[PDB]
């Protein structure tokens, strides 16, 4: 979402 990542790549 508004820069948080949940999948690494």
């Amino acid at each position, epitope marked *: *979402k*508004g*820069n*948080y*990542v*949940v*999948t*690494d790549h």
Partner: antibody
Amino acid sequence: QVKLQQSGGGLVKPGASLKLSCVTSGFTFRKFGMSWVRQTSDKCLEWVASISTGGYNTYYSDNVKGRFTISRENAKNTLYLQMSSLKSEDTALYYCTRGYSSTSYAMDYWGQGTTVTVS
Amino acid sequence: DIELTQSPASLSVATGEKVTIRCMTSTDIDDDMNWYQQKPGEPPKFLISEGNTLRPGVPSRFSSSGTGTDFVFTIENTLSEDVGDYYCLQSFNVPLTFGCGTKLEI
């Protein structure tokens, strides 16, 4: 079928440390981001920390940054919350939580809850 | 840090009444509003996810609508089984914030 089994709470004195654990089943664990949420004495829910699928990105509330560490071991299907320097303000029911899909930390599956009481 | 203010604080209804619980945000959340229900002494249960979609298995009597800062949760005909606390969550930005709940029927 998805299970999040939690463990590791207790009553501790201020300044103590506790390691909360969450073991999961019924899904490929590395495909999901995971989080810890805590429900305080006034039934308010408060997000504590989140970790990405590989564990390369972690987020914490300003409340716990520097005292709490979220981690996971993908091989064992478990999520941890290492809490240090426990304050009375950290008394809450801590819940292990699963992010519902790839891009969001919004939670679909919640653990049964672990009380940590600092007193 | 996006504040979410859930309203009303509490309500008591008769079964069959319609309820409306609002959740307002300080900033536009791109419709990543999510609704939870916590029945006494159970973990919160996911009712509606981002984009106002009712989750599988949640009954049709629950619905939600909302503009980027103003969202609404509705129960059309309140059944007995619906007492609990309802919470909204924005998952647009970290920190993820929650409203502090609304308790349904006492």
